[PDB]
From a paper:
Crystals of the effector/immunity system Tae4/Tai4 from S. typhimurium readily grew to a size of 400×100×100 µm3 within 3 days in 2-ethoxyethanol containing conditions. Experimental phases were obtained from a Single-wavelength Anomalous Diffraction (SAD) experiment and an initial structure was built and refined to a resolution of 2.3 Å. Native protein crystals of identical crystal symmetry diffracted to a resolution of 1.8 Å at the Swiss Light Source (Villigen, CH), allowing the refinement of a structural model at near atomic resolution. The core of the Tae4 effector is formed by a central antiparallel β-sheet flanked by α-helices. Similar to Tsi1, Tae4 locks up the active site by inserting the loop region between the α-helices d and e (d-e-loop) into the active site and thereby prevents substrate binding and catalysis. In contrast to the Tse1/Tsi1 complex which has been reported to be a heterodimer, we found that the inhibited Tae4/Tai4 protein complex from S. typhimurium forms heterotetramers.
We therefore determined the three-dimensional structure of the Tae4/Tai4 effector/immunity system from Salmonella typhimurium by X-ray crystallography. Tae4 cleaves the γ-D-glutamyl-L-meso-diaminopimelic acid amide bond as do Tae1 members; however, it specifically hydrolyzes the acceptor stem of the muropeptides.
Residue numbers in the entry:
A (entry chain A), D (entry chain A): 2 to 141, 148 to 161
B (entry chain B), C (entry chain B): 27 to 127
């Protein structure tokens, strides 16, 4: 099944910090790589934290690049990998929206994926959405969203 | 403007990572270091390789970033260490060898 | 350590000049700018080309140094402008065309 | 013939400053290129200033890369070019010293060329020497001199 919304939202908050702080929180190889500056985009790491924390851990043999935290659980560090991981584990998405805007997602909550153009470091973003705002809203213009995808969390 | 990041081949991304990461090592200024760090992470995003290849590129980078370069003008020639680095035979061979194409 | 400066071919020197000069344009910190400036001058020393080829490389560099690059992480991605710059087709053609080999 | 020593030493002092200041002093294309940061090694520019000032101007059609100053005279900007220019205009050198040290040049004054290894921006240096010190002594270790060459100035 899927992580409960409430547990997911709570888990995300623990790691809704600068990527350096995320490294201190999670530790292990996640922390070592952030300390070394190898990871600068915390987005897929936070999403991994959520899945790990809510009883839906990323499997070790999952076909995506990942590093372990001090918890001995696994953290995907590429956005594209995180997106693809969800496509393969979450089931059928509940909303798929071409040329999306935030107002298309009002009234529904869960895991949101937006893919678009305009960013130089990624094809898109993955976060949580509570029906009004994203969980990392405080960290987020020139990005033009092409496709919006939501998996509802109960 | 979107950068050209998605247009690079896998070995080009690794070469681009090598250069930017090396620049992140040699420069002291935080804004510059962060910038080079952020730039390197973009090339890591699009790579298909495990994190250890970047660790190894960093191992080779540190053989240049630790060098002392001198001249008849006042400078540490930090930029030049990284330019010398990206022409490194072991770096290019490491990248060509890669298990994850 | 002496750098590898004398080992570069003429077009390699021009490519090395292009990169370091572009880095001198995009970074704000004086120590970094001076360093990149000093590094570029080393490649100019060993060139056989007139100063106008460097002026033209600078003309092309300014088409990248003026760009605004954005991402899902906080950065101006200055380093990346210069990495995109050195893959520029007009730059490589300019260098290949050169009258002074 | 050759520039007099006294006039050469005097001329050199006018431009014995930071490369930025040299650009302000000389002006024209020298100044424009220094302002643009294209020239950072003032060594061959100062030597050019000396020859220009003392009645031995660098000829326009001289086979070396050069730029004009506000004076409409010509300034060689590569050390190797400056060295070669002197070899071709100054006549037979008066002292050539393998593996030189400063003490080999005591008692004689003129234009000194040292070529060696250890510098990342040049194969050597060209300056004036008064029998005790160089004219740019205040601006000058890891350089290992291979060959020292002096043209005596009267």
């Amino acid at each position: 099944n899927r992580p409960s919304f409430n547990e997911a939202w709570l888990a995300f908050r623990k790691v809704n910090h600068s990527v350096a702080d995320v490294g201190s929180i999670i530790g292990g190889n996640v922390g070592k790589n952030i300390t070394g500056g190898y990871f600068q985009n915390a987005c897929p790491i936070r999403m991994s934290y959520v899945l790990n924390a809510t009883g839906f851990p990323i499997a070790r043999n999952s076909p995506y690049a990942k590093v372990s935290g001090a918890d001995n659980k696994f953290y995907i560090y590429r956005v594209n990998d995180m997106i693809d991981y969800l496509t393969h584990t979450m089931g059928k998405p509940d909303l798929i929206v071409n040329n999306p805007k935030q107002s298309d997602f009002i009234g529904k909550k869960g895991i949101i994926v937006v893919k678009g153009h305009g960013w130089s470091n990624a094809r898109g973003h993955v976060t949580l959405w509570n029906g009004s705002i994203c969980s990392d809203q405080c960290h987020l213009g020139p990005f033009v969203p092409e496709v919006g995808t939501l998996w509802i969390l109960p | 403007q979107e950068a050209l990041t998605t247009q690079y081949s896998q070995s080009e991304l690794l070469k681009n990572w090598a250069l930017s990461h090396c620049l992140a090592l040699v420069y002291k200024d935080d804004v510059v270091k962060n910038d080079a760090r952020a730039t390197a992470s973009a090339y890591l995003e699009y790579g298909k390789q495990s994190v250890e290849i970047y660790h190894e590129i960093d191992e080779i980078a540190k053989k240049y970033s630790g060098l002392k370069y001198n001249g008849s003008i006042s400078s540490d020639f930090n930029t030049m260490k990284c330019i010398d680095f990206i022409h490194d035979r072991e770096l290019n061979e490491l990248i060509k060898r890669r298990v994850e194409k």
